[PDB]
Amino acid sequence: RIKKISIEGNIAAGKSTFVNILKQLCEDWEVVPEPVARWCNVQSTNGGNVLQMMYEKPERWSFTFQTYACLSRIRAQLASLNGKLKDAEKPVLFFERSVYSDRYIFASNLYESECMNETEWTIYQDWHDWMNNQFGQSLELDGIIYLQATPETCLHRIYLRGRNEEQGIPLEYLEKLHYKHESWLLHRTLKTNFDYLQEVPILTLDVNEDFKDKYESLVEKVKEFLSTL
Amino acid sequence: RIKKISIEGNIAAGKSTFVNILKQLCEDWEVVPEPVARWCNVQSTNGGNVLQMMYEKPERWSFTFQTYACLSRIRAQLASLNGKLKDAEKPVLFFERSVYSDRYIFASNLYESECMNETEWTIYQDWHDWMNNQFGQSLELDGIIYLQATPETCLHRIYLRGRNEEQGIPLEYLEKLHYKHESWLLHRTLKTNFDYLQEVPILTLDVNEDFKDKYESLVEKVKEFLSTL
Numbered sequence: 208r209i210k211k212i213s214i215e216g217n218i219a220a221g222k223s224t225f226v227n228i229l230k231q232l233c234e235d236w237e238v239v240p241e242p243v244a245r246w247c248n249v250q251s252t253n254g255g256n257v258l259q260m261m262y263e264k265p266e267r268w269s270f271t272f273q274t275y276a277c278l279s280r281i282r283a284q285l286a287s288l289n290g291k292l293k294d295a296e297k298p299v300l301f302f303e304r305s306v307y308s309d310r311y312i313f314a315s316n317l318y319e320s321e322c323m324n325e326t327e328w329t330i331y332q333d334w335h336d337w338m339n340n341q342f343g344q345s346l347e348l349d350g351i352i353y354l355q356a357t358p359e360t361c362l363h364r365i366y367l368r369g370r371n372e373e374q375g376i377p378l379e380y381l382e383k384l385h386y387k388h389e390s391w392l393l394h395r396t397l398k399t400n401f402d403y404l405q406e407v408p409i410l411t412l413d414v415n416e417d418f419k420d421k422y423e424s425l426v427e428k429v430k431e432f433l434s435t436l
Numbered sequence: 437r438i439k440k441i442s443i444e445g446n447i448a449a450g451k452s453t454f455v456n457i458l459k460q461l462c463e464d465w466e467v468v469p470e471p472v473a474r475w476c477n478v479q480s481t482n483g484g485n486v487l488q489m490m491y492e493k494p495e496r497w498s499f500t501f502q503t504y505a506c507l508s509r510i511r512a513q514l515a516s517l518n519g520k521l522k523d524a525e526k527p528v529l530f531f532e533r534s535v536y537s538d539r540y541i542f543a544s545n546l547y548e549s550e551c552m553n554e555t556e557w558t559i560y561q562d563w564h565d566w567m568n569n570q571f572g573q574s575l576e577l578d579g580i581i582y583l584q585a586t587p588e589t590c591l592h593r594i595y596l597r598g599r600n601e602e603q604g605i606p607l608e609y610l611e612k613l614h615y616k617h618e619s620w621l622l623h624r625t626l627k628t629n630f631d632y633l634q635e636v637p638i639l640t641l642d643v644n645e646d647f648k649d650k651y652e653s654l655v656e657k658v659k660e661f662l663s664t665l
């Protein structure tokens with residue numbers, strides 16, 4: 208089939224940067240970016256910036272955001288499956304984040320910080336289970352690439368990138384997401400409702416150093432990791 | 437196929453009352469009630485009462501409620517299709533309200549009353565279109581029964597029934613829903629995104645009088661209306 212790989216990491220760890228060198232390594236590699244742009248301008252399929260609304264008032268807008276974020280991701284991921292630039296021969300589909308990071312990293316953290324209440328979190332989990340019982344199986348992952356960077360590196364890369372919505376994100380929030388990533392992907396101690404994930408191979412790339420100096424090594428490790436699935 | 441009929445009306449017009457006499461008229465008739473009970477106790481598939489949360493603070497909770505309401509309805513409606521008490525022979529499936537009342541009566545009214553903002557309403561409409569593009573076609577209606585009662589009759593029936601959450605519902609809100617029902621189902625002037633609905637037969641039963649005295653006439657009219665689809 209199409210091999211499906213998610214790329215996971217903290218805010219500003221270097222996912223779009225990493226994603227932008229993949230297509231040139233192999234004509235058979237496709238990428239489904241996180242639709243962060245539709246989150247910044249909500250429009251049917253100039254509107255609200257729901258990402259901005261969550262960060263300005265997260266106890267008001269987290270559920271709405273998290274629900275919209277994950278639905279719009281599932282849609283973009285499905286559309287690239289049947290998007291039949293498969294046929295292909297040796298096809299790999301890279302997902303920028305996943306429905307699993309949406310729920311177990313981001314939505315979970317907001318619930319634990321009291322930005323979703325029990326009713327919101329119950330609803331979200333029920334929607335998320337149900338959505339994946341329909342429109343998953345097909346989204347299942349063969350592998351995960353974890354781009355690992357300290358919270359402080361990420362706080363600096365947020366400044367570098369300059370996305371308006373992220374400029375007030377405190378270190379404390381990024382550290383919370385860091386530990387949840389480390390639990391899921393380094394220690395593999397996270398309990399999820401998706402049994403096969405516990406067994407999915409993970410490649411861990413330390414991307415704290417500068418991208419130019421790391422590039423050659425990263426590519427070797429990506430190609431080798433791919434060849435084993 | 438299975439004939440699908442929705443029963444539409446204002447809050448407390450007499451939908452559950454009407455629904456409770458259907459099964460005894462014909463062994464082939466099934467009913468999918470509106471899951472108002474799961475709305476009053478949110479639980480995965482003692483929790484929050486999201487219905488109560490919407491009415492106590494509708495500008496905070498309308499989007500969440502309206503989104504949960506309609507997803508849980510679509511799920512109960514699907515599950516009764518494949519619920520294969522079809523086979524049957526002459527099978528009729530009655531839906532207590534529909535995805536169309538959810539959007540064009542209730543969600544629309546809350547958006548127009550500023551209980552959803554543009555971003556919420558954009559998201560809701562996008563979710564609703566998308567949900568029906570997947571999990572509809574199969575939910576399409578052959579007919580609609582409109583149970584018609586004045587807003588004042590309904591305000592009285594709310595008192596009679598005594599559902600705690602509805603006791604503070606003002607006449608003004610019920611009147612708004614009344615006119616939207618009258619536009620969709622009596623005048624047929626409502627524009628929707630579902631072209632076939634404009635042509636769907638509608639039976640209109642005036643249920644302002646007492647149910648006991650009306651019963652015999654209602655049954656005649658239901659059976660005849662059914663025989664013509």
Ligand SMILES: Nc1ncnc2c1ncn2[C@@H]1O[C@H](COP(=O)(O)OP(=O)(O)O)[C@@H](O)[C@H]1O
Nearest residue numbers: 218219220221222223224364367368416417418
């Ligand atoms: N390894 C790296 N070295 C130097 N800069 C990086 C590196 N990775 C990302 N950046 C920079 O950090 C910012 C965040 O990168 P981005 O790819 O947008 O992260 P994400 O997709 O994870 O938010 C950008 O300014 C980018 O130029």
Ligand SMILES: Nc1ncnc2c1ncn2[C@@H]1O[C@H](COP(=O)(O)OP(=O)(O)O)[C@@H](O)[C@H]1O
Nearest residue numbers: 447448449450451452453593596597645646647
């Ligand atoms: N035609 C009618 N005559 C007298 N009472 C009615 C009639 N229809 C409904 N009722 C009463 O009105 C209340 C609301 O009815 P219900 O069936 O729960 O409405 P809905 O399902 O539309 O909310 C109940 O107390 C019920 O006994």
Ligand SMILES: Nc1ccn([C@H]2C[C@H](O)[C@@H](CO)O2)c(=O)n1
Nearest residue numbers: 218241243276308309313314373
């Ligand atoms: N489920 C998600 C996914 C992403 N984000 C945020 C992190 C970044 O601020 C932006 C883009 O990744 O969206 C989020 O809050 N929840």
Ligand SMILES: Nc1ccn([C@H]2C[C@H](O)[C@@H](CO)O2)c(=O)n1
Nearest residue numbers: 447470472505537538542543602
């Ligand atoms: N889409 C819907 C459907 C129903 N309701 C309300 C009306 C009644 O108070 C209760 C049960 O019909 O739910 C609502 O606000 N929105």
